[PDB]
Scaffold this active site. Structure first.
Site, short mmCIF file in Angstrom:
data_model
loop_
_atom_site.label_atom_id
_atom_site.label_comp_id
_atom_site.label_asym_id
_atom_site.label_seq_id
_atom_site.Cartn_x
_atom_site.Cartn_y
_atom_site.Cartn_z
N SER A 39 0.81 -1.22 0.00
CA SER A 39 0.00 0.00 0.00
C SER A 39 0.85 1.28 0.00
O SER A 39 2.06 1.23 0.26
CB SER A 39 -1.00 0.00 1.16
OG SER A 39 -0.36 0.10 2.41
N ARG A 40 0.20 2.41 -0.32
CA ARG A 40 0.78 3.76 -0.40
C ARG A 40 -0.21 4.79 0.19
O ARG A 40 -1.43 4.63 0.04
CB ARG A 40 1.14 4.08 -1.88
CG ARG A 40 1.37 5.54 -2.25
CD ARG A 40 0.84 5.89 -3.65
NE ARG A 40 -0.52 5.38 -3.89
CZ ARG A 40 -1.65 6.01 -3.56
NH1 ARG A 40 -1.60 7.18 -2.95
NH2 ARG A 40 -2.82 5.46 -3.83
N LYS B 293 7.58 -0.35 6.57
CA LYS B 293 6.94 0.96 6.41
C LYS B 293 8.07 1.96 6.14
O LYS B 293 8.88 2.22 7.03
CB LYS B 293 6.10 1.37 7.65
CG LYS B 293 5.10 2.51 7.39
CD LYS B 293 4.84 3.30 8.66
CE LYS B 293 3.55 4.10 8.62
NZ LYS B 293 3.26 4.76 9.93
N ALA C 299 -0.30 8.29 3.43
CA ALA C 299 0.33 9.18 4.42
C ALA C 299 1.35 8.37 5.24
O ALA C 299 1.10 7.18 5.52
CB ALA C 299 -0.73 9.82 5.32
N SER C 300 2.51 9.00 5.55
CA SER C 300 3.70 8.46 6.24
C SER C 300 4.61 7.62 5.29
O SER C 300 5.71 7.21 5.69
CB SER C 300 3.34 7.71 7.53
OG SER C 300 2.90 8.61 8.54
N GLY C 301 4.14 7.41 4.05
CA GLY C 301 4.88 6.70 3.01
C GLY C 301 4.21 5.52 2.35
O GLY C 301 3.01 5.53 2.08
N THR C 302 5.02 4.50 2.07
CA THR C 302 4.61 3.25 1.41
C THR C 302 4.92 2.03 2.32
O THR C 302 5.82 2.08 3.16
CB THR C 302 5.19 3.20 -0.05
OG1 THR C 302 4.94 1.95 -0.68
CG2 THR C 302 6.68 3.51 -0.12
N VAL C 303 4.12 0.97 2.19
CA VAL C 303 4.27 -0.26 2.98
C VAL C 303 4.60 -1.40 2.03
O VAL C 303 3.89 -1.63 1.05
CB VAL C 303 3.03 -0.57 3.87
CG1 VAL C 303 3.18 -1.91 4.59
CG2 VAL C 303 2.78 0.55 4.87
N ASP D 153 -6.12 8.03 16.53
CA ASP D 153 -6.54 7.79 15.14
C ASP D 153 -6.98 6.32 14.98
O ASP D 153 -6.72 5.66 13.96
CB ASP D 153 -5.52 8.25 14.08
CG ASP D 153 -6.05 8.26 12.65
OD1 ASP D 153 -7.30 8.38 12.47
OD2 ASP D 153 -5.22 8.11 11.71
C1 LIG Z 1 1.93 1.99 19.29
C2 LIG Z 1 0.97 2.38 18.17
C3 LIG Z 1 0.25 3.66 18.55
C4 LIG Z 1 -0.06 1.29 17.93
C5 LIG Z 1 1.83 2.56 16.94
C6 LIG Z 1 2.00 1.90 15.79
C7 LIG Z 1 2.97 2.61 15.08
N1 LIG Z 1 3.50 2.32 13.81
C8 LIG Z 1 2.93 1.38 12.97
O1 LIG Z 1 1.92 0.74 13.27
N2 LIG Z 1 3.56 1.20 11.77
C9 LIG Z 1 3.14 0.31 10.76
C10 LIG Z 1 1.80 0.34 10.35
C11 LIG Z 1 1.35 -0.53 9.35
C12 LIG Z 1 2.26 -1.42 8.76
O2 LIG Z 1 1.81 -2.26 7.78
C13 LIG Z 1 1.75 -3.65 7.93
C14 LIG Z 1 2.24 -4.33 9.07
C15 LIG Z 1 2.13 -5.71 9.11
N3 LIG Z 1 1.58 -6.43 8.11
C16 LIG Z 1 1.11 -5.77 7.02
C17 LIG Z 1 1.17 -4.39 6.89
C18 LIG Z 1 3.59 -1.44 9.16
C19 LIG Z 1 4.04 -0.58 10.16
N4 LIG Z 1 3.40 3.65 15.73
O3 LIG Z 1 2.67 3.63 16.95
#
Ligand SMILES: CC(C)(C)c1cc(NC(=O)Nc2ccc(Oc3ccncc3)cc2)no1
Ligand SMILES: CC(C)(C)c1cc(NC(=O)Nc2ccc(Oc3ccncc3)cc2)no1
Lengths: 278, 278
Positions: free
Chosen positions: A20-21, A42, A23-27, A136
């Site tokens: 995905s793409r 991320k 806000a905060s970038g691409t995953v 959020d």
């Molecule tokens: C502590 C809390 C407030 C919950 C939090 C999460 C965070 N960063 C984050 O979730 N980053 C993130 C989000 C989605 C992602 O996408 C994924 C992850 C796993 N599998 C598939 C997609 C990867 C990293 N910063 O604070």
């Protein structure tokens, strides 16, 4: 006792694919060349940018718990900046609740377990020193593992999970400890209904107007009478999305009300709910 | 990026029932009052005694990974000293393999998933800086979570962190080829459901036999011909427990062998194997 977060060299990430793409970038998905596990990355695709990734990494590393997305390491290189976490193979709550062809049934035990695990996770953040507040909380940020257990994430959109007093933000609204519970109430409603909140409304702006006046419909149409523990649930929803921030419960209070509900479901039924989704 | 291990006040550890005792410490099953989760406590039932526990908590906190027992915090008070970890509800690998009345059928898909995850967790430990070498790997230290996924533990009845069936001969009197030996024994034990050296009464009789290059029996009786990827798994076992430490594989090699084996199992077969236990 202190623990350093591992630093992962970008070149150690093999088989990189876009997921995905926004806000905060691409995953992206990838596999660690040495660890032999699937990971999620991320990343951004300059000094202020560097600090943001480092801050997210720190929160995620400190927020370590059973219902929080586990961070594995950080990519901090001249050429690449990113957060490395465990890969969640079953998408988000949003996709489970609204892809009705892919998912015809989503059994009550699984639905209540998802709700119980969202509350256990948000509750843990709220109990840190100092308390950690999501602000959020949405269905897109509720990731599901291989056995459909919850991992709370933050993808870094919709206003439907926002308390009305957060519409015009300030130093008190951003320090609100009764924001997450409002979002939780809407999530709770959306889980029990499988309905897009305020579906009939045209503009998100009109939703904000409606919301500020004083919620998605609680009737037999949206919430049928066959919903296990319906009365106690509706009481929790109504209580959580209450216009008075002071008339809102803690996550601990919800958990205490949820604990007996979850005990009315036999352990086997959770496994049957998941087999049904495959 | 550093993370402080939370300090849990003893009074937050509700319903503290004992589970198992040892010369060094005790393991009890509590319940966190604020977090609303079931937990496990490894406590001393003072100067040196304190340094011992904190060193185990420092190791467990640094060893954090998907297949290592997750530490939730430390309970450091003048009244009580103990490590709080997550609670593994499904016991150990020993119990799953040898309580044949409780578990008459443990399907191959689950057996291979367990072996893969032991290798993933051990491989992660060996990839730390400096490498962490378990050196006391056994079925008793392979814990099983809610969904029968592996969490590698280190029970300490004799000592805190700093049977001879799984011990390589050279270790009877630093080695980076010990855990692979232990792993080869575990693999044999998982695929046969037999006790290594069944007819041997005295442990010295095992120690003697092992030092003479003898190993648990590999035939149709111990390892039936119907075992998926039988030939391939025997080769891994025989490499792993070789008399010459240098002829034993690294965990990278061992994982590169395991990876195509695990791909042959459809994801639903793992769920079905777990439900068959419930
Ligand atoms: C502590 C809390 C407030 C919950 C939090 C999460 C965070 N960063 C984050 O979730 N980053 C993130 C989000 C989605 C992602 O996408 C994924 C992850 C796993 N599998 C598939 C997609 C990867 C990293 N910063 O604070
Ligand atoms: C990194 C590695 C070498 C694997 C390790 C483990 C460890 N300590 C430990 O597992 N302590 C422990 C063991 C069993 C316990 O009892 C439980 C835990 C969970 N569920 C039930 C019983 C509690 C703590 N120190 O280094």
């Amino acid at each position: 006792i202190c623990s350093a977060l591992p630093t992962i060299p970008y070149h150690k990430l093999a088989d990189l694919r876009y997921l995905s793409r926004g806000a905060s970038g691409t995953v992206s998905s990838a596999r660690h060349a040495d660890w032999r596990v699937q990971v999620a990355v991320k990343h951004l695709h300059l000094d202020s940018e560097r600090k943001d990734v480092l801050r997210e990494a720190e929160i995620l590393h400190k927020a370590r718990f059973s219902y929080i997305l586990p961070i594995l390491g950080i990519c901090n290189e001249p050429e690449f900046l990113g957060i490395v976490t465990e890969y969640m193979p079953n998408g988000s709550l949003n996709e489970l609740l609204h892809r009705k062809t892919e998912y015809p049934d989503v059994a009550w035990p699984l639905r209540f377990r998802i709700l119980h695990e969202i509350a256990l996770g948000v509750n843990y953040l709220h109990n840190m020193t100092p308390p950690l507040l999501h602000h959020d909380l949405k269905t897109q940020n509720i990731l599901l593992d291989n056995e459909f257990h919850v991992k709370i994430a933050d993808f870094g959109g919709t206003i439907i999970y926002m308390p009305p007093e957060n519409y015009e933000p300030g130093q008190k609204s951003r320090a609100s400890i009764k924001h997450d519970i409002y979002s939780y109430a809407v999530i709770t409603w959306e889980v029990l209904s499988r309905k897009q909140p305020f579906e009939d409304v045209t503009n998100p702006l009109q939703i904000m107007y409606s919301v500020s006046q004083g919620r998605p419909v609680i009737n037999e149409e949206s919430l049928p009478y066959d919903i296990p523990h319906r009365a106690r649930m509706i009481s929790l929803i109504e209580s959580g999305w209450a216009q008075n921030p002071d008339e809102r419960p803690s996550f601990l209070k919800c958990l205490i009300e949820l604990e007996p509900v979850l005990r009315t479901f036999e352990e086997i039924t959770f496994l049957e709910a998941v087999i049904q989704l495959k």
